[PDB]
Design an enzyme around this catalytic site. Structure first.
Site: not given
Length: 197
Positions: A26, A104-105, A159, A172
């Site tokens: 992101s 992540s995303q 995380d 993260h």
């Protein structure tokens, strides 16, 4: 170099043996973000500059933070973008071994894309690495329809996205060492397992 479009820019008459498709996290820049370049550099060292094509997921994938709350962990437009890249690799270079990754995303995007992909193409992805996998708990550390042995998940203790929460905590943002060593090591090992050499 945060932007790599080797697959889109590449000549089909001179296809690379390995094609790596990667989805950034992101709000990250270019189409590779913070982790992609480290992985890319190590793949190039292993297969040589002309032996591997590095391709980030750009276009409609804007890596908008809020989209990580959508049903699949990313937008439908983003999934269509990555699916299109896998389809382009398959048509442009039918004999190339594929590898993939996401952060992540981008990890949710990688998982959703692989899940929807035609099996003949999905089965060409020799290995996939996921960092800070937002659907880790929900999918029990797996990518639907994809073998566990070809999957490697990097989820740091602390995380929160790995345990079901959509909150960004310090762990993260601590995947740098993994992107420099174990992630490319895994991808290289998986490619060599099926290609030899």
């Amino acid at each position: 170099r945060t932007t790599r479009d080797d697959l889109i820019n590449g000549n089909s008459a001179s296809c690379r043996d390995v094609i790596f498709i990667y989805a950034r996290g992101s709000t990250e820049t270019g189409n590779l973000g913070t982790l992609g370049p480290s992985i890319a550099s190590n793949l190039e060292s292993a297969f040589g500059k002309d032996g591997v094509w590095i391709q980030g997921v750009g276009g409609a994938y804007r890596a908008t933070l809020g989209d990580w709350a959508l049903p699949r962990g990313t937008s439908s437009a983003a999934i269509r973008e990555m699916l299109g890249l896998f389809q382009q690799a398959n048509t442009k270079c039918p004999d190339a071994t594929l590898i993939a990754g996401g952060y992540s995303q981008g990890a949710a995007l990688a998982a959703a894309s692989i899940e929807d992909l035609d099996s003949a193409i999905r089965d060409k992805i020799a290995g996939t690495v996921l960092f800070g996998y937002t659907k880790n708990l929900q999918n029990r550390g797996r990518i639907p329809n994809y073998p566990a042995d070809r999957t490697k998940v990097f989820c740091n203790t602390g995380d929160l996205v790995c345990t079901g929460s959509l909150i960004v905590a310090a762990p993260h943002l601590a995947y740098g060492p993994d992107a420099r060593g174990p992630a490319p090591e895994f991808l290289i090992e998986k490619v060599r397992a099926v290609r030899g050499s």
